[PDB]
Each structure stands twice: as C-alpha cells, then as structure tokens.
Amino acid sequence: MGRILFLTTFMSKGNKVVRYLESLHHEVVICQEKVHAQSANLQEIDWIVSYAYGYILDKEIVSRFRGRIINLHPSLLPWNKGRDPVFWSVWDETPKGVTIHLIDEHVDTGDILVQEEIAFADEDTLLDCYNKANQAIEELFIREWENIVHGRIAPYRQTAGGTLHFKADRDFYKNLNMTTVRELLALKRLCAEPKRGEKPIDKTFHQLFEQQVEMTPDHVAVVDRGQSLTYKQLNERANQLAHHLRGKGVKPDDQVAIMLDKSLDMIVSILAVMKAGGAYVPIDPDYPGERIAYMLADSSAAILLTNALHEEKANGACDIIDVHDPDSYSENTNNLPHVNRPDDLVYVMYTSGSTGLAKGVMIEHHNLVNFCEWYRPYFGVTPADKALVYSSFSFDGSALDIFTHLLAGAALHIVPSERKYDLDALNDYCNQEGITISYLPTGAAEQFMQMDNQSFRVVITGGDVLKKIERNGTYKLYNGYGPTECTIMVTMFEVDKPYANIPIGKPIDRTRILILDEALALQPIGVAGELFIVGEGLGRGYLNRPELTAEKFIVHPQTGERMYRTGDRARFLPDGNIEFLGRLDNLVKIRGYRIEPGEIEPFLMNHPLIELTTVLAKEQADGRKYLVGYYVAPEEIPHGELREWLGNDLPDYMIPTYFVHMKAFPLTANGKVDRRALPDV
Ligand SMILES: *P(=O)(O)OCC(C)(C)[C@@H](O)C(=O)NCCC(=O)NCCS[C@@H](CS(=O)(=O)NC[C@H]1O[C@@H](n2cnc3c(N)ncnc32)[C@H](O)[C@@H]1O)[C@H](N)C(C)C
C-alpha cells in the first residue's frame, strides 16, 4: 500500500501492468519526462518501476532510491543491453528471454531479480516478436510483483559478458524491422562479412605469372595466326624489354602508354611495363589524334610504347620506344627483382566521363590478383585450355582474356583482325585448334550460339543484357557482371534455363554487395536499391579526380567500411542471385560501351550550326538500346558530316548511330526537354 512511479517512453499509459498495479490499490504516477532532484513528486514516491525508459536518471536520484528502483527490460541480460534489444537478439542470434532486474549505476547492468527464456517462430515478424516478448514480461511481472514488493526474491548478479547498443546503432537498419525472422536471417547471411582471418593478398600478378612460367615453361603461352610463343619465350623476351624499360627510369606508379594493334608485341609490352614497375595506359590506335593526345596529356606518362607505323600519330609528344627497334631489348633474360607491392597501380583504363571529359580509372595489383585467384579454381582452368584474346585491349574485358588464363597456364590466341567480325571463320579456327574457353561480348556471344559448336566447354559473356539462351552447343553459358571500377566483374551466374530477367549471379571471392536505399540503409530482400560493392575488388580511385573518388568511394558513416557507389540499381533474389534493375543515372551500356550521352553535348554544341543537343537511347522491339542524337539546327546537317565531326574528337563507339534534326525541342511544364515526346524511326 503505497505509491509507484512508472517511467516509460514508448509504451502506452493504458498498459495491463499499469492497470494491474492500480487494481491492487497502489496509487501510480506515470511520468515520461525527465525527473530531477528538485521535482515535487520525488518526495512522495515509494517505489520506482521503469519499463524501457528512454533516458538515464541523474546519479543523485539513483543513489537516493538505492534498492527500490526496478526495470522490466525484455531481453535475456546480459545479452542485448540498452537499445533495440529484441532486434539485436534476433540479428546477433543470441539466447532470447526477458529479465526483471535492479537498476544500478550503468545501463541495464544491475543484478537480475527474475529471468525467463522465450522463443520466436521463424514466420513471426520483428514486430510480432517485439509484441510477444512485451506480453511475456508483463505477465511475468503480474505473477511476481508481490514477491518483488516484499523483497522475497534474491537478486543475482549478471553473467560476465554481453553486448551493448545505442539509439544510433539502428539507423542503418531502420527500414528492416518489417521482415520475417527467416527472411531477416537470410539477409544477414547475404550481408555477412566472411569470418575473421579471411585470406588476404600478398603477391603481385607478375610474381604469380613467373611462378606459373616455371611450372609449365614449354607449354604454349600465346598464339597469333601461324606463329606462337611459349611461356619460357614470352617470359624471357618480356624480361629483356623490362630491363631496358627499368633502365630508362620507369618507377612504381609511373604510367607508360601503349599504342599497338593486337599482336605478340602487345603481350610482351604489357608484361614489360609491369615488371619494370609501372602501370600501362592502353590507347586504342583507332582513336582520333585528339583523343590520343588528351590521354597522353592528362596521364602523367612520358614513355609511349608504340611502333613506327603509328609513331607519327603522337607528334613527338612522348619519348617513343619502338617495340620493333632491336635496341629496345636487353641481353638480360632473367626475371627482374620484384619492386612492386599489391597496393601499386597495375594499369589505368579510360571509360566515359560523367560530366565532361573521361577519367582514367586506376586499378591496383590487389584488384587483378583477387580476380584471377577466384577465376582459376571456380572454372577449373588448366594449361590444356586455349583462350581467345578477343576484346579490345583498352577495355578490362581483355584483362580477363589475358591475365586470368596466363596464371592458369592456358594459351592465349589473339583473334585475327579478319576473323574477328566473321564469326564463321572464328568458329572454324576454334574447332580446328580446339579453343576450349573464351570470353565473348554479348553481341558476339549470341551470334556464336547459332553455330553448331562442339569444342567449347565454357563461354563467358557479359557487359550487355543477354536475352537469347538457346544454343546447339553443349557448353556452359556463364553470365558475368561488374564495372571497370570494381575490377572486370564482381558477380557470376551459371545460365541454366530461360528467365524473364536473367540474373547476374552471386558475388565473387572477398566481395560483398549491399542493396541500399536512398538513405544508404540496408534494403530487405526483395526491395530494390543501389548496388554497393565492398571488398578487395575496389580500385584506388579515379586519376586526377579526387572529388569523384570521394563521391564514389565513400566510407560508410555507420558501418565504417569503404564502399564504391556504382550508381547501379539491383536487388537480391530469394536464392541469393542478384537482379539488375537498370541505373538511376544518364548512362546506358550500348554494345559493350559505358557512355554519357551528355558528354557528347559539348563537342556537338560547339559546332557553329548546332545550338542545342540531346542524345537519348531508344530500343527497337528486341530491347537493344541505340543512341539517337536530336539537335536543333537551322538546316539538317549531313549524317556523315556529323559522324566525321564527332570522329575527330570521339571514338567510333561514342558516335551516335542516328542523328535527328528538329526545328525546336518539346518542353515540359517545368521547362525541361520532354524526352518522352521525341519521335523515332
Ligand atoms: P563495334 O562496336 O565497332 O566493334 C566492337 C565489337 C562488336 C567487335 C565488340 O565485340 C568489342 O570489341 N567489344 C570490346 C569493348 C569492351 O570490352 N567494353 C567493356 C565492357 S564493360 C565492362 C566493365 S564497364 O566498362 O565498367 N561496364 C559495365 C557496366 O554495365 C553494366 N553491366 C555489366 N554487366 C552487364 C550485363 N551482363 N548486362 C547488362 N548490363 C551489364 C554495369 O552497370 C556495369 O557498371 C564489363 N564488366 C564487361 C563484362 C567486361
């Protein structure tokens, strides 16, 4: 027979516990606001019962009422002390229960008066569990209140250990409390960092390559039409050029431009740059001189490895080292002493720019080794395999063709320029020589599925939305996904049946992929969001673009992990595979090229007769997006004149397929161009 102080924050004042206490003729005072020592109520309180109160009482108040302040906290203390106990008890998968304990100096650390276990079914939502636990602890309080008042119960100190969480710890998970226990723990596995001690990377690529050369020295390494070089021959010739290159001042993180057609000299030059210590800057010779001079200027590359056929195209801007000049090779054929760390730059490839000119993507040796070290065991690549070096060597799809197969002892086959686009002769060569594994761009892959091939066992594809699955061959089709920034690819799917949306697969080694909403919070399984990549595949950033590195390579505020903002939208499927749901941004992947349609606008608008331009992507029935360039000009400009105009500054793949002349552009109510209202032919 006294007075009771009920201190709560979220709970309702019409609770069963409150009504029960008043039924025992106890006058109860409900108070949610902060109480201080000078409060007029503190002198008339006989008992203080708190129940998930959102604040701590001043140490003066807690000591004055020592031995008479109790808290009903619905967790199995010491597990899940403090905030959001039920959620953390489920996420961390700790034992579950409710505990009525004394309040001591710290948060939910006092001795336990009463403790009871509870169980949650898999189908219950986190709200159901929260409610079920709240009901169980209230009934526990109703049965044991008489024992608590009379002090009959013997409090016992908490076990040593436990965890602790604060209010902000849940910000990252605010959108998650609406999911079944099964679905929640399913997301936890898909977003669980691998167990502490995960295999790191200590070696550089050429360290592993030379090791593999000494394992299969007389095995065919590279094949170019009739000629071919073995691993021993390739390793020695590259070492000769590397000694000469190193002797000319090539240092770690230095850039060495390479401008050559696909050939044996290319592979020799590529490895020579690595062994020398620097990173190679591939420059497709089909680029216009404007583009070539730009890459040479922006990149801090003084050395340009090229031939005499294309030497003049550089206009003496760089100290040229002709790959045909015999004095470019030293007598020394031994492997050079390794001077590179896995954190050093291995190459700098150029992709399209977001707002303006393109940015050199810096890829490290720890981003290529991780990819090759996963590729070889997963696909079971062996020296018996012969791989096609098909993709243009300025795109990282060529790094897949070349580097992953060399570490596996396989043989590289440079695709002859004549048979490159005549897939009939390519398939003929592949059936004759026995080409077993190769990566083919989506365009070439679909065309190859029609052939009656029987030699290949693994064809890897990717880069564009695959739609055709039917093929007469017995080879496993593999669909891969990943941006250049995250090293070649990050996910892999084994295609087995038709799908309305062929998934891109599961993450590769040491790669976590997070689906986050606009607020960067985790998305529940089945909820769309931005695909965030975490792990060893992350690059060093963009060359000479630190502002974009900070924007795209962010350190998560709650998690603290370094992640790359891809700008891509994706979702986790229930089975773990990822579904690609397009991209927020202006970009679009057209036949293997990441382009900014707006990055053509300055060149185009710079034309005297051109006032405004907007390049959109339109698909004709079969879903394949192509670019139409609408422009407002007085008179229509000849199609070929614009293609040559863009050809002076842009590569062929950045030249829109169609250009449409218009007298004026349609506008929205807000003044924006009404992109929806533009025609198409
Ligand atoms: P023609 O055009 O004049 O001659 C060209 C031909 C036709 C001969 C062609 O065979 C060729 O030579 N292609 C070489 C060009 C090339 O290799 N480009 C690189 C491909 S993109 C690369 C990484 S990326 O640059 O960052 N772009 C990937 C982004 O696109 C999305 N993506 C990735 N995978 C996708 C699939 N399977 N479907 C749909 N979209 C996909 C992501 O947002 C990526 O950010 C990727 N990684 C490939 C696989 C190397």
User: Would you call the peptide bond into 383 cis, given omega within 30 degrees of 0 as the criterion?
Assistant: no
Residues with CB under 6 A from ligand 1: 351, 391-392, 395-397, 441, 443-444, 462-466, 479-484, 488-489, 504, 566, 568, 580, 589, 591-594, 652-653
Which residue type does 603 have?
F
- State whether residue 279 is helix, strand or coil: strand
Q: Solved how?
A: X-ray
Residue 278: name the closest of 302, 262, 314 by CA: 302
Which of 316, 276, 278, 322 lies closest to 296, judged by CA? 316
Residue indicated by tokens 């000591």: 63
CA-to-CA separations, 451 to 229, 446, 473, 474, in angstroms, rounded: 30, 10, 8, 12
What phi and psi, each to the nearest 5 degrees, are found at residue 128?
A: -60, -45
* CA pair distance 454, 188, nearest whole angstrom: 42
Q: Is the dihedral of CA 167, 170, 175, 179 positive or negative?
A: negative
Give the residue among 183, 190, 187, 188 at the shortest CA–CA distance from 125: 183
Residue 622 lies in domain? 581-677
In which order are the strands placed within the sheet that holds 97-102?
Answer: 27-31, 3-7, 47-50, 69-73, 97-102, 112-117
Ligand 1 atom with the smallest distance to the CA of 441 is: 10
Residue nearest to atom 48 of ligand 1 (CA): 463
Residue among 396, 398, 488 to mutate when testing ligand 1 (max atoms within 8 A of CB): 396
CA 650 to centroid of ligand 1, rounded, Å:
18
- In 32-102, which ranges are E strands? 47-50, 69-73, 81-82, 97-102
> Ligand 1 centre and the CA of 653: distance in Å?
12
Tell me the one-letter amino acid at 38.
Answer: Q
Residues 6+ away with beta carbon under 8 Å from 525: 179, 183, 186, 187, 190, 572, 574
| Ligand 1 center–CA 441 separation, angstroms | 7
DSSP state of 159: P
* Closest listed residue to residue 507, CA positions, set 531, 539, 541, 472: 531
Residues 474 and 456: their CA atoms lie apart, in Å, by: 8
Q: Please enumerate in sequence order all residues whose Cβ is within 8 A of that of 101, keeping only pairs 6 or more positions apart, or say none.
A: 70, 71, 73, 77, 108, 110, 111, 112, 113, 115, 155, 158
State in Å: Cα 394 to ligand 1 middle: 12
Tokens of 532: 């965030």
User: What is the best residue among 391, 419, 530, 589 to mutate for testing ligand 1's pocket, by most ligand atoms within 8 Å of CB?
Assistant: 589
Which residues have a Cβ under 8 Å from the Cβ of 31 and sit 6 or more positions away? 5, 6, 7, 41
Rounded to whole angstroms, the Cα distance separating 639 from 624 reads 22
SS3 558: coil
- Smallest Cα–Cα separation from 300: which of 245, 347, 248, 256? 256
Q: Which value, in Å, is the radius of gyration of the alpha carbons in the chain?
A: 33
Residue 590, domain CATH: 3.30.300.30
Single-letter amino acid, residue 135: Q
DSSP code at position 412? E
Q: How far is CA 638 from CA 6, 329, 557, 612, 658, in A?
A: 83, 49, 53, 17, 11
Cβ-contact 503, 573 below 8 angstroms: yes
Distance, in Å, from the CA atom of 564 to the CA atom of 511, rounded to the nearest integer, reads 11
Q: Which atom of ligand 1 is nearest to the CA of 587?
A: 43
Q: What is the DSSP letter of 228?
A: E
Token pair in block for residue 207: 């360290």
Nearest by Cα to 507 from 489, 487, 526, 485: 489
**Cβ neighbours around 200 below 10 Å, total:** 10
Q: Please provide the distance, in angstroms rounded to a whole number, between the alpha carbons at the two ends of the chain.
A: 88
Say how far apart CA 262 and CA 222 lie, in whole Å: 12
Rounded to whole angstroms, the Cα distance separating 73 from 9 reads 13
CA–CA distance from 219 to each of 151, 385, 421 (Å)?
Answer: 84, 11, 29
- Name the token pair of 451: 């052939």
Integer Cα distance of 445 and 459 in angstroms: 8
How remote is the CA of residue 477 from the centroid of ligand 1, in Å? 17
Ligand 1 pocket test: which of 286, 351, 395, 586 has the largest number of ligand atoms within 8 Å of its C-beta?
395
Resolution rounded to one decimal, in angstroms: 6.0
Which residue, judged by its Cα, is nearest atom 1 of ligand 1? 653
Phi/psi of residue 23, each to 5°? -70, -30
Q: Which of 139, 137, 146, 57 is nearest to 104 (CA)?
A: 57
Q: Are 579 and 503 in contact (CB under 8 A)?
A: yes
Token digits of residue 169 = 């710890």
Region of residue 82 (phi > 0: left; psi between -120 and 50: alpha; otherwise: beta): left
CA atoms of 225 and 413, how far apart (whole Å) = 8
| Residues 37, 60: Cα–Cα separation, whole Å | 7
